[PDB]
Write an enzyme that holds these catalytic residues in place. Structure first.
Site, PDB file in Angstrom:
ATOM      1  N   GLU A  35       0.806  -1.220   0.000  1.00 38.46           N
ATOM      2  CA  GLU A  35       0.000   0.000   0.000  1.00 38.46           C
ATOM      3  C   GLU A  35       0.859   1.301   0.000  1.00 38.46           C
ATOM      4  OE1 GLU A  35      -3.116   0.437  -0.498  1.00 38.46           O
ATOM      5  OE2 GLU A  35      -3.967  -1.584  -0.216  1.00 38.46           O
ATOM      6  N   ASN A  46      -7.678   9.489  -5.525  1.00 37.74           N
ATOM      7  CA  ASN A  46      -8.537   8.621  -6.343  1.00 37.74           C
ATOM      8  C   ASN A  46      -9.361   9.426  -7.330  1.00 37.74           C
ATOM      9  OD1 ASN A  46      -7.933   6.304  -4.560  1.00 37.74           O
ATOM     10  ND2 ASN A  46      -9.278   7.383  -3.115  1.00 37.74           N
ATOM     11  N   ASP A  48     -12.589   9.713  -7.822  1.00 42.06           N
ATOM     12  CA  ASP A  48     -13.819  10.334  -7.353  1.00 42.06           C
ATOM     13  C   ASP A  48     -13.542  11.548  -6.468  1.00 42.06           C
ATOM     14  OD1 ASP A  48     -12.900   9.174  -4.975  1.00 42.06           O
ATOM     15  OD2 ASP A  48     -14.693   7.973  -4.632  1.00 42.06           O
ATOM     16  N   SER A  50     -11.675  11.633  -3.596  1.00 48.34           N
ATOM     17  CA  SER A  50     -11.133  11.204  -2.302  1.00 48.34           C
ATOM     18  C   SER A  50      -9.617  10.961  -2.371  1.00 48.34           C
ATOM     19  CB  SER A  50     -11.823   9.909  -1.839  1.00 48.34           C
ATOM     20  OG  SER A  50     -11.472   8.814  -2.679  1.00 48.34           O
ATOM     21  N   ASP A  52      -6.320   8.686  -0.331  1.00 52.62           N
ATOM     22  CA  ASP A  52      -5.840   7.657   0.614  1.00 52.62           C
ATOM     23  C   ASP A  52      -4.578   8.142   1.367  1.00 52.62           C
ATOM     24  OD1 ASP A  52      -7.867   6.016  -0.598  1.00 52.62           O
ATOM     25  OD2 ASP A  52      -6.439   5.010  -1.794  1.00 52.62           O
ATOM     26  N   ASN A  59      -8.929   5.814   3.318  1.00 53.96           N
ATOM     27  CA  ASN A  59      -9.679   6.650   2.391  1.00 53.96           C
ATOM     28  C   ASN A  59     -10.572   7.730   3.096  1.00 53.96           C
ATOM     29  OD1 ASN A  59     -11.368   7.437   0.181  1.00 53.96           O
ATOM     30  ND2 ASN A  59     -11.268   5.455  -0.704  1.00 53.96           N
ATOM     31  N   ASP A 101     -15.736  -4.274   9.594  1.00 51.05           N
ATOM     32  CA  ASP A 101     -16.988  -3.731   9.054  1.00 51.05           C
ATOM     33  C   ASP A 101     -17.727  -4.711   8.148  1.00 51.05           C
ATOM     34  OD1 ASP A 101     -16.148  -3.778   6.370  1.00 51.05           O
ATOM     35  OD2 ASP A 101     -15.696  -1.653   6.285  1.00 51.05           O
TER      36      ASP A 101
HETATM   37  C1  LIG Z   1     -19.494   0.185   9.007  1.00 49.18           C
HETATM   38  C2  LIG Z   1     -19.126   0.460   7.559  1.00 49.18           C
HETATM   39  O1  LIG Z   1     -20.012  -0.254   6.718  1.00 49.18           O
HETATM   40  C3  LIG Z   1     -19.114   1.944   7.181  1.00 49.18           C
HETATM   41  N1  LIG Z   1     -19.206   2.104   5.711  1.00 49.18           N
HETATM   42  C4  LIG Z   1     -19.492   3.502   5.346  1.00 49.18           C
HETATM   43  C5  LIG Z   1     -20.879   3.944   5.808  1.00 49.18           C
HETATM   44  N2  LIG Z   1     -21.950   4.118   4.771  1.00 49.18           N
HETATM   45  C6  LIG Z   1     -23.348   3.879   5.260  1.00 49.18           C
HETATM   46  C7  LIG Z   1     -23.515   2.730   6.231  1.00 49.18           C
HETATM   47  O2  LIG Z   1     -22.697   1.777   6.299  1.00 49.18           O
HETATM   48  O3  LIG Z   1     -24.531   2.757   6.950  1.00 49.18           O
HETATM   49  C8  LIG Z   1     -21.674   3.765   3.346  1.00 49.18           C
HETATM   50  C9  LIG Z   1     -22.635   2.769   2.712  1.00 49.18           C
HETATM   51  N3  LIG Z   1     -22.006   1.705   1.928  1.00 49.18           N
HETATM   52  C10 LIG Z   1     -22.888   0.561   1.710  1.00 49.18           C
HETATM   53  C11 LIG Z   1     -23.946   0.300   2.773  1.00 49.18           C
HETATM   54  O4  LIG Z   1     -23.663   0.146   3.988  1.00 49.18           O
HETATM   55  O5  LIG Z   1     -25.136   0.229   2.352  1.00 49.18           O
HETATM   56  C12 LIG Z   1     -20.591   1.497   2.280  1.00 49.18           C
HETATM   57  C13 LIG Z   1     -19.991   0.130   2.275  1.00 49.18           C
HETATM   58  N4  LIG Z   1     -18.708   0.078   3.014  1.00 49.18           N
HETATM   59  C14 LIG Z   1     -18.595  -1.081   3.928  1.00 49.18           C
HETATM   60  C15 LIG Z   1     -19.724  -2.087   3.793  1.00 49.18           C
HETATM   61  O6  LIG Z   1     -20.874  -1.774   4.191  1.00 49.18           O
HETATM   62  O7  LIG Z   1     -19.466  -3.202   3.292  1.00 49.18           O
HETATM   63  C16 LIG Z   1     -18.121   1.376   3.505  1.00 49.18           C
HETATM   64  C17 LIG Z   1     -17.997   1.617   5.017  1.00 49.18           C
END
Ligand SMILES: C[C@@H](O)CN1CCN(CC(=O)O)CCN(CC(=O)O)CCN(CC(=O)O)CC1
Ligand SMILES: C[C@@H](O)CN1CCN(CC(=O)O)CCN(CC(=O)O)CCN(CC(=O)O)CC1
Ligand SMILES: [Cl-]
Ligand SMILES: [Cl-]
Ligand SMILES: [Cl-]
Ligand SMILES: [Cl-]
Ligand SMILES: [Gd]
EC number: 3.2.1.17
Length: 129
Positions: A35, A46, A48, A50, A52, A59, A101
Site C-alpha cells: 500500500e 482517487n 472520485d 477522495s 488515501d 480513504n 466492518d
Molecule cells: C461500518 C461500515 O459499513 C461503514 N461504511 C461507510 C458507511 N456508509 C453507510 C452505512 O454503512 O450505513 C456507506 C454505505 N455503503 C454501503 C452500505 O452500507 O449500504 C458502504 C460500504 N462500506 C462497507 C460495507 O458496508 O461493506 C463502507 C464503510
C-alpha cells in the site's frame, strides 16, 4: 517516517494487530508494504476526489476528514493528517474499525491481489518477536 519491516511488525504487535479478527501479523505487514512502501507520509488521489493516507492508505471518503471530499463521512473521528504521523497509533485504531466492518481485509486492494493466499509469515520471518 519510513519503517523497517521488523520495526513495523513490533509496533503493530504492541498495538494489538497480531491475530486481530483472525488476521495473523504477516498479513498486516504485507498490506503496508504494497500500500505505502512502509512510508507514513504516503498519499494517493482517487478518481472520485477522495484521497488515501498513511501506512495503510485509509480513504477520506468514509474514514477521516480532509476538508475537500464533499459529502463524505469521518467514521474514525480524526483529521486525515493525523494518519501521516510517525506514531502509527491513529492508523492502527482506524484500521481496527475498517477490518471489522464486514469485508475483512479485502478493503485493501493491494492485500487482496498480492498477499491473500500466499505465505504471509515470510514477512515477519527473522524478526525478534
Ligand atoms: C461500518 C461500515 O459499513 C461503514 N461504511 C461507510 C458507511 N456508509 C453507510 C452505512 O454503512 O450505513 C456507506 C454505505 N455503503 C454501503 C452500505 O452500507 O449500504 C458502504 C460500504 N462500506 C462497507 C460495507 O458496508 O461493506 C463502507 C464503510
Ligand atoms: C442501506 C443498506 O446498507 C441496507 N442493508 C440492510 C440494512 N442493515 C443495516 C443498515 O444498513 O442500517 C443490514 C446490515 N448489514 C450491513 C451494515 O449496515 O452494517 C448487512 C449488509 N448489507 C449492506 C452493507 O452494509 O454493506 C445489507 C443492506
Ligand atoms: Cl503471519
Ligand atoms: Cl470533506
Ligand atoms: Cl509507532
Ligand atoms: Cl474476515
Ligand atoms: Gd457501509
Amino acid at each position: 517516517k519510513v519503517f523497517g519491516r521488523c520495526e513495523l511488525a513490533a509496533a503493530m504487535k504492541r498495538h494489538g494487530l497480531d491475530n486481530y479478527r483472525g488476521y495473523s501479523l504477516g498479513n498486516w505487514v504485507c498490506a503496508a508494504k504494497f500500500e505505502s512502501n512502509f512510508n507514513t507520509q504516503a498519499t494517493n488521489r482517487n478518481t472520485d476526489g477522495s484521497t488515501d493516507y498513511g501506512i495503510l492508505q485509509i480513504n477520506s471518503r468514509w474514514w477521516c476528514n480532509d476538508g475537500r471530499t464533499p459529502g463524505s463521512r469521518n467514521l474514525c473521528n480524526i483529521p486525515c493528517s493525523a494518519l501521516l504521523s510517525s506514531d502509527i497509533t491513529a492508523s492502527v485504531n482506524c484500521a481496527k474499525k475498517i477490518v471489522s466492518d464486514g469485508n475483512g481485509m479485502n478493503a485493501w486492494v493491494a492485500w487482496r491481489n498480492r498477499c491473500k493466499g500466499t505465505d504471509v509469515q515470510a514477512w515477519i520471518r527473522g524478526c525478534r518477536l
